[PDB]
Amino acid sequence: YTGRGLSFLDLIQEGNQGLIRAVEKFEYKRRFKFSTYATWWIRQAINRAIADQARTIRIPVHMVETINKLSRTARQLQQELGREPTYEEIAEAMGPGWDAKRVEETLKIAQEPVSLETPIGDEKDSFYGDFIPDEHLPSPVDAATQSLLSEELEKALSKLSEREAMVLKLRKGLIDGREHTLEEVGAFFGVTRERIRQIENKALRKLKYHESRTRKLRDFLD
Amino acid sequence: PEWMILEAVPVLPPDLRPMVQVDGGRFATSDLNDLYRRLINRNNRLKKLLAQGAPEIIIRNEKRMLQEAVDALLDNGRRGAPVTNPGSDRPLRSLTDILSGKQGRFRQNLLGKRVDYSGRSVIVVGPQLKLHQCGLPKRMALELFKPFLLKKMEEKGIAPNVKAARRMLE
């Protein structure tokens, strides 16, 4: 059972683990020699372990089993066809409910991650993570633009009264990140939603006029 | 001195040892992850076996294996044979190798670091130059001083905004 993603010793620990359960259930009334009933739990444990501890991404055993039969049926094709199976051949050879789409899909799930410390060039002076960027973290250009946008957007609110701006702050969620509904904003200003709604529209429109003299904020939209 | 024996093993913040998705859509992980998981597999296996109770011979082997694992995590290849992930005869990277060597943190990212605002090009002789002068291609100097020029351009009417200025440069 070696050469399946686990070392002799790791597998042994699993086979012994199952063996204790087998001994706990073995009956001499059957009269079968221990070897007979023991092997069952010895093979099951190691085979289950291989399907439990061989993927960096935990994948169910049943899925692993499908994948295994995919390769089995595939190789059968490969050796018969004298060539090389495709999504659609194996799909039909597999049986019903099996299409080429499903093959490629299952292969996509089966895809395994690779090491970032993998060698680049014959000179072992380069590694994969060296040539992999950071997409997550604020890139000085992105953070700069956000600082500029919020500044100018505020400068646009300075073109409104604090009531108009504050209404927009809560409604759009600039006040405290959380956008507050019109009924809440009318709870803050003690105003009927309709009046709050209309002054919000008036404020947005006033921003539009000021923008029609500036259009500075459009640049951030890009 | 008892601290030289380890009962609680730390685990490095996952960002410092991640499995991010590459442009190809595939993910790529650090060897530390497979080392740490290897320990967990052995540890919980032992915890169960011990809790259940079973012949020492087994437990002995299991405890030893947990040792070997911890050793690989701290300094692989130092003891026994280098731990190798299935497929390649490539030893995995241990915390030590991350801190040790020219590729280690010190001689790679602490004593010397790649820098921004820096370029490179073939050189030629400039007999006309004065001793305190050099010949810098215009496009290089554009990037090199890009932010400074964004400001200067703004001072001028060459650009409506800094973003559109940079997009002009694009």
């Binding site: 010793l9 | 011979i57 082997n61 294996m65 026994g80």
Partner: peptide, 14 residues
């Protein structure tokens, strides 16, 4: 001893 395999072999070989 250096080979943990041989070790388990002798441990259970007694």
């Amino acid at each position: 001893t250096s080979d943990p395999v041989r070790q388990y072999l002798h441990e259970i070989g007694q």
